[PDB]
Amino acid sequence: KWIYKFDVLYQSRNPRYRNYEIIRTNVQEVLAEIVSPSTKNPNSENPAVKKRFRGIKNVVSRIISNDKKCRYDLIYNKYLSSSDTRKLKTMIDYSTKFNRVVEVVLIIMGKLLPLDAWGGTENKKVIQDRIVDFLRLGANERLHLDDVLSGIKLSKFKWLSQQDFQIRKRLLEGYINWVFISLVKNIVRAFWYVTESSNMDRSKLFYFTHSIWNELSSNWITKYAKGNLVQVVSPQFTNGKIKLIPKRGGFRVICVPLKQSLYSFNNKRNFALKQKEKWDYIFYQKYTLSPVRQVLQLKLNALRKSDMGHRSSVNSTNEVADRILTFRNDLLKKNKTLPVLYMIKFDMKECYDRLNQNALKESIAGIFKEDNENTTYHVRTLSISKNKIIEVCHSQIEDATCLVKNKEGQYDLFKRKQGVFQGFSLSGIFCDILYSTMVSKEFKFLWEATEDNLLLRLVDDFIFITSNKDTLKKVKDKISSNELQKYGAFVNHEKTVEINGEAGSSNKMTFVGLDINCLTLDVKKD
Numbered sequence: 001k002w003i004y005k006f007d008v009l010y011q012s013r014n015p016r017y018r019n020y021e022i023i024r025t026n027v028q029e030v031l032a033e034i035v036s037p038s039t040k041n042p043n044s045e046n047p048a049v050k051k052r053f054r055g056i057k058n059v060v061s062r063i064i065s066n067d068k069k070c071r072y073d074l075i076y077n078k079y080l081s082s083s084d085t086r087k088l089k090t091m092i093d094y095s096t097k098f099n100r101v102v103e104v105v106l107i108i109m110g111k112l113l114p115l116d117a118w119g120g121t122e123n124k125k126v127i128q129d130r131i132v133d134f135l136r137l138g139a140n141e142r143l144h145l146d147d148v149l150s151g152i153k154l155s156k157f158k159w160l161s162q163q164d165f166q167i168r169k170r171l172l173e174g175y176i177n178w179v180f181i182s183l184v185k186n187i188v189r190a191f192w193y194v195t196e197s198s199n200m201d202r203s204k205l206f207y208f209t210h211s212i213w214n215e216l217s218s219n220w221i222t223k224y225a226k227g228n229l230v231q232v233v234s235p236q237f238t239n240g241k242i243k244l245i246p247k248r249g250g251f252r253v254i255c256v257p258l259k260q261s262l263y264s265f266n267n268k269r270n271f272a273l274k275q276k277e278k279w280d281y282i283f284y285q286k287y288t289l290s291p292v293r294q295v296l297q298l299k300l301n302a303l304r305k306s307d308m309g310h311r312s313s314v315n316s317t318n319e320v321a322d323r324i325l326t327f328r329n330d331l332l333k334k335n336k337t338l339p340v341l342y343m344i345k346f347d348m349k350e351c352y353d354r355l356n357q358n359a360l361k362e363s364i365a366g367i368f369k370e371d372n373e374n375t376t377y378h379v380r381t382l383s384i385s386k387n388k389i390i391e392v393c394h395s396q397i398e399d400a401t402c403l404v405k406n407k408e409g410q411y412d413l414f415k416r417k418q419g420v421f422q423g424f425s426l427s428g429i430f431c432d433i434l435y436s437t438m439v440s441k442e443f444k445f446l447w448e449a450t451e452d453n454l455l456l457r458l459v460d461d462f463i464f465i466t467s468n469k470d471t472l473k474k475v476k477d478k479i480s481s482n483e484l485q486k487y488g489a490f491v492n493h494e495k496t497v498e499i500n501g502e503a504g505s506s507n508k509m510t511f512v513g514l515d516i517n518c519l520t521l522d523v524k525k526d
């Protein structure tokens, strides 16, 4: 509940390890952090505390000296160099193994802290185990200080109610806190870019050396920017910071929205903006962005109970199984026994990147077609007009800007050629509006006499089940053509799978981790 892990993540560097220093503060600055972390004025304490300053200063001075003497360039070459420029199949295989991360961190701690700074031999093992625990923490996990101190013998820290034994405790709390916050965290940020994988669990962190991470990220960005981005030398909250997340062979490109303007982000520490800009973002989120996100979702649900075209969009794996079993029971009413069924699954290539912006605007306009320009809406009450919806959506689509941190620590700007950024507040609902509009227009023949046809959309994955072999031909014709490219939906033809119940080497199909039997329509998990 005291020592956090998230603030070591996503730290990109370009370090020179020859003549490198972990501790950037002097001995007096550290003494303030240990003794009075809140006030940062240790001279105000009563003399029972100040008499311990010399013993604390000498220990810190030895740690600071050991830091200046430590040859981190040699430690990197021996343990982290890995100078083998061949390629690997998965990105997380470029990361340093977790055992090697622990070994590097504990070796540096051994070269920084003398035995008496650890509190003796027995306490050194205890603190080392707690350092490993901190390294095993997930992105949203934390470690409590009293958890660390519960295994520490205070009496062994000779350099330091009677009020003597209460001062020793507080000094131990402040010192141990300084070890984790300022030494252990700075060691991690000095050698690794810490991030989580696209494999959902955030409790599994991966540690990439800054040398290999800068090569992998920059190579991917220059590739990705060619087909998706346009550099802007030019400049409501439409700016974001690019964040790459390793995905099996490549990266997932995420644009984390800036909660400030580009001015407050540029300068390091202008505070006269930060506190007031916070309110500008809150009022935009509460009174502009949320009503837009709600009215868009409400209009979508309104077409989710009026038209079959939008009815075909689902949101979870279990929701697919529920609509399939319902489709099975609907067939067991028209036939009294399951007929021969035909199944096909297909998916779109990079639905968010290839999304056609012009067709998206027509879709958003299409769901506000029965309203006048003066129309107003009320949400849980908050007021917002149809025009304000269109204005917010157009700025999110057309004015989206991302910041890419390149090799030398600079910051270049980019807009999108087509598509929408992942991570923006309306990107998901945008893709839902466009794809539902596409399914409602292009697959209109399915919705006539729907008692023998089933189409389901998990956002970029499609499954189609039918008892009509002719209708299966119409669906195969629609996806094999390029008529869906108008919307930016490019069928991934290599992953299009088709099975049916007449014959064939298989009667099973896995779609979202469900295992579907085209004979019985029984669906189990995979």
Ligand code: NA
Pocket (backbone or CB within 6 Å): 021, 023, 024, 025, 026, 064, 067
């Ligand atoms: Na120093």
Ligand code: NA
Pocket (backbone or CB within 6 Å): 499, 500, 501, 502, 503, 504, 505, 506, 507
């Ligand atoms: Na088959």
